[model samples]
Target chain A: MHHHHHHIEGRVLLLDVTPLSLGIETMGGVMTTLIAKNTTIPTKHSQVFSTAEDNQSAVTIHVLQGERKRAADNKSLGQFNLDGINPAPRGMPQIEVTFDIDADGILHVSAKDKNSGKEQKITIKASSGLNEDEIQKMVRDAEANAEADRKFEELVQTRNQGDHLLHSTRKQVEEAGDKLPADDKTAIESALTALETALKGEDKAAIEAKMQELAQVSQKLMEIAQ
Target chain B: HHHHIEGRVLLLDVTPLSLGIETMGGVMTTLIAKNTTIPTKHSQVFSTAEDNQSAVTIHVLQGERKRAADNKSLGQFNLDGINPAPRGMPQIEVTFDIDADGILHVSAKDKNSGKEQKITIKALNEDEIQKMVRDAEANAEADRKFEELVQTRNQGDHLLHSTRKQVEEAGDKLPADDKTAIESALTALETALKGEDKAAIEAKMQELAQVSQKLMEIAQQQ
Candidate 1:
């Protein structure tokens, strides 16, 4: 009760660091670290990520904590959906996720759509973040989980890349409509479906093959657009 | 330059909501209010509301609302076997203690009789706490004014009930002037309660108080 309004407001006082690493779940179930463990508090960082499909109007911002690389392995602090996005092709809308941790160990995360200026913010204290048991367990598990984490990252990257290519090609196909022949449109659809099936799998090589196949088939549409 | 690994400390977060209990007059009196850090204790003296009362029912709530019914009801209990004294004479002390773990331990005791009752509340998880903090922030000038209006409206309703009973009890026994005056005040208050304007209701309550004083004085002499 003693700590009132005038606390840490334009005053000379020592700062502190967060007890654990903080991050958010990016595409493909990856934990992208915003503020690393033992990083000084009263700090902030921002990164821009986009939607996975054309005309996507919402993005789920999953806030996370821990030393793990894969988001599933880390602890989810909170999750919120930020909507009111302007419809456009994939990667056209820029949504910025900002992680701001205060000196009093409060972790504040916000997601704002740059185009619409719509935002949502949530707060969780580093106050009761983690116990000693968790940090030590995450540390010991980190060493053994490195190879597994790396493989998961590769799968996620391939899936994300395939999504980007599919959405972009689909949008371009819609634009080059009647100018593009029926045969070319059907070829694009078949290639897109093949890649979509591969995206669901954890097989890195198969997804890569399908992505290249789709890319090769879409060259005709690109030629038509030009 | 100075990387000492001995020790470091960051300030702990405060309690997300005001800790309070429903005292007499149906008002939730705050003890350890919001934004106060954990590990704190506050003691306030309370008492029974009726003459020769044997028990006091305690309702503990969490929120910013002044009226007891509007807040979050955490828990309720009764402190029994008081010293059969007049209301407000029992000297019942209610203490709210939020310990280092942020768990609340509340105990109400009658000093003369040593009768005691307590309830423990581990109300909020981290997720729920922030929402309350945000809610408290969201309700600023606009929400507070509305809550005040509601609280004042409730007060008028309560006073109207008690005053109407008094007028009914002394119906034929009162002077004709007093009866007509009080009846007019009561109807206006009744009319005010049905409307949306808080000031109108409050003004009617103030007007009723004038007649209420005369009614009480006449009843006391009889």
Candidate 2:
């Protein structure tokens, strides 16, 4: 028989955090995230964002969260359209949206029309590959069907940040061209290419690992690239 | 003179210069120390100095110098994608190994990311290490003194910085007894640091850590 050792330690809850970003869609498809990734919950915030067009009948309030630039591209965890709105011109109505992610990591989105002095609370839950309990297990293991989307989103952000760094470093590499050593130049280029190839995959772990390697080389690349 | 010869073989080799990695405050954290039997391996856990640092650079070095820049540079690589945690939180386990062939292999793995980076250099083998040993032996005594002073001072500086920060953070809340102890310990260490006595400075350092541990307890009470 195998002895199961728990080896439990005493006194501390370092913390638990929400995994991906939290944000809502806006007019003209310009989406901005309200809360960032790995944010500790029991948190809430509301910001005033306006419509782009005139005589709007109803404001379609769609909330999405993930690592993508476009709102539609990301997963819509909660979605609702505010129906009763006083007619207003372009960029005039004060629509204060109250977004809350409480201890449960569930969404409680609210919309307020100061023009009419009205508040709306509508909650929506998007379907996932597993039940809440099953999904909780996915959160723990970080490798499962439901968790695949979660981790893939992680890769999206990692790759984008990497691209940003790569180009930013490449910009300096070019400006300091020939001022930099040839081997250093090649070292950065090779790292860049490897990262780009990893960027094409859904392996968030691999790309991030590669991204770190790329950043290490890019650091040496810039120390003299100045 | 008849044939009177003995046959023998050397099994184990000696390490020339100390092998270590760059650690907090630019200190060389020795793993496989100099003048030891070869074909050995050692490992230690390192942590990041700042929060949200993505990569922990495993900058390996050689020689007897306490500070990394003063030591001979062995190549470095990165252990990437650290799970962002507060300073001194994320665990990075780094290892230095000398195989039977005397090839040097250094590796680092991020505990959170489960990702690893390693490099093996064959150039730092027996003959190369032997030459370095002979050259470094010429200045070994001075090197020891320099290394000791550098390490002691850096350690004292770190203790001072942390203790000051902790006291400031726990200000208006740190217990009177703990505060007085920490302040006195800090004073002793600072005075000892200004002088060249390593033993006095080290004794003060131990006292400082003992007093500082109470501050950590108070801070953790949140």
Candidate 3:
């Protein structure tokens, strides 16, 4: 017998935003935006429109995406002519159009007669976009590049530690000025200068060595002060 | 600018097209409808349309068009190794599963032999979609102008074709001067169509429309 375990050890959850605003074309050649760009994905928005002609039973809903104010200026994704609506005077019957974008960046559009509950839906396979293989490759490359990022993080930590120790040692020397032996004061000042110069260099080992030397001199000063 | 927000964010994707398989008589039987929410799975049972058919070709398509020929072809595969039996004797199951990434996976199986075949169709990628979004925003004006150019070109072609037919049928009934003028106008319009300048094409089309009206007037007088 064979058993399959599809267990995921660590998972990454992505919060994607819509790349563009999606809406249906409305009066005056304008696109009435239903969902704006940068809105979190897996979201749905609906807006109501009315028939333009008297006794109209069908209306064409043109879906578009862009930042343009005019429908003609925007990129038309698709259009659906919803038939079988109950005849009514112009602007009396409400037609609701819903734009739904899922996590995969796929768009699902639906139109309904708000009065009668009759509905029609379509899945617009937008002509523009990347494929699954490309997206997977991007994810893999991001994960691989994370390894190099750790080295940069460690360098930042080392720099911050050196700065903090230098500040503390300088303040201690100032408070103990002239009361200490001249040799001990000279040793402490020399260690501090060497440590500051090492911090400017890229060699991590040299910086660590100088940092240790400075710490020892500071300890001697502390003993004298006590 | 790059702080990670704590918590698990879940995404529910939707199908971009209706997925269907080619059935008997070459008609498409939709297993999953368009705009349906995903990660969902749906299956339907099918059988051999012909007697003793050992293999079935499953053609996958994406679109809302009523006919399979009108829709976009995604991919296809064959489920072989089925036991020989008469049509409708063996139950064949077809399943469609759309994942959260909106990629489609299709499987076909034979109940008698348990043979199965599966395929994943990579429809579109993320970068391409992003590029399109950017292009749409950047090229809106240019696209609108191109659309106008196409419309004007088509109209010019239609007018030229009809006027040429009229000139042929007139057959010397029109005056020689008018005939020469129409012929020259047609030649200029053809030249403009071959060129890339939209404004020049529109200007040439206006010239052709004027010459065509003159030809109609000469014909009417005769």
Give the number of the best model, judged by TM-score: 1
Give the Cα error of residue B21 in candidate 2, in Å.
1.8
Candidate 2's docking class is incorrect
Q: Considering every candidate listed, which one attains the maximal lDDT?
A: 1
Q: Of the pair 1 and 2, which is ahead by TM-score?
A: 1
Instruction: Sort candidate 1 into its docking category.
Output: incorrect
Ranking by TM-score: 1, 2, 3
Candidate 2 backbone collisions, by pair: none
Error of 1 at B105 (Å): 51
Q: Give the poorly placed runs of model 3, Cα more than 4 Å off.
A: A1-226, B1-123, B138-141, B217-222
| lDDT per residue as tens, model 2, A31-150 | 456554444443454455444444555666677765554456566776666645666544456566766665465667887776687777886542233355654453444323334544
Error of 1 at B84 (Å): 67
Candidate 3, residue A6: Cα displacement in angstroms equals 50
Candidate 1's TM-score reads 0.43
Query: B60-149, model 2: which lDDT tens digit per residue?
Result: 789766656767887867666777655556666666778768898988776678989889987456675667666566766666676677
* Model with the higher TM-score, candidate 2 or 3: 2
Query: What is the lDDT for B166 in model 2?
Result: 79
